């Protein structure tokens, strides 16, 4: 049963160039790709944040990191503790994290 869920991530340093994205366990997530199939989180200047929307799989367990990767292809730096959801919820909410 696929769900919508929105990740929010907090403190991300960014500079020009930087692009966030997540990757985690999960085929939907990427399986830990940084190349192929990560998925793009964005700032929201309201919240002040980075966030994005993920289809996941309800009712299973996750483990993902956000990560910067640059324009030419570049991963900087990856979220210093690795998150989890255990399990995805069955209904579309958020989940929050600082980097």
Same mark, same amino acid.
């Given at each position: $049963?696929?769900?919508?869920? $929105?990740?929010?991530? =907090?403190?991300?340093? $960014?500079?020009? !160039?930087? $692009?966030v +994205?997540?990757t !985690?366990?999960?085929?939907? #997530?990427?399986? @830990?790709?940084? %190349?192929? +199939?990560?998925?793009? #989180? +964005? +700032?929201?200047?309201?919240?002040?944040? @980075?966030? !994005?929307?993920?289809? #996941?799989?309800?009712?299973?367990?996750?483990?993902? %990191?956000?990560?910067? %990767?640059? =324009?030419?292809?570049?991963?900087?730096?990856w979220?210093?503790?690795?998150?989890? @959801?255990?399990?995805?919820?069955l %209904?579309?909410?958020?989940?929050?994290?600082? @980097?």
């Amino acid at each position: $049963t696929p769900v919508m869920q $929105t990740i929010v991530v =907090k403190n991300v340093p $960014t500079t020009i !160039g930087d $692009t966030v +994205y997540i990757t !985690g366990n999960r085929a939907e #997530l990427g399986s @830990w790709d940084t %190349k192929q +199939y990560p998925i793009q #989180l +964005y +700032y929201d200047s309201h919240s002040n944040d @980075w966030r !994005g929307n993920v289809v #996941l799989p309800a009712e299973r367990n996750i483990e993902f %990191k956000a990560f910067i %990767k640059s =324009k030419d292809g570049t991963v900087k730096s990856w979220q210093t503790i690795q998150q989890s @959801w255990n399990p995805v919820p069955l %209904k579309t909410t958020s989940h929050t994290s600082s @980097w």
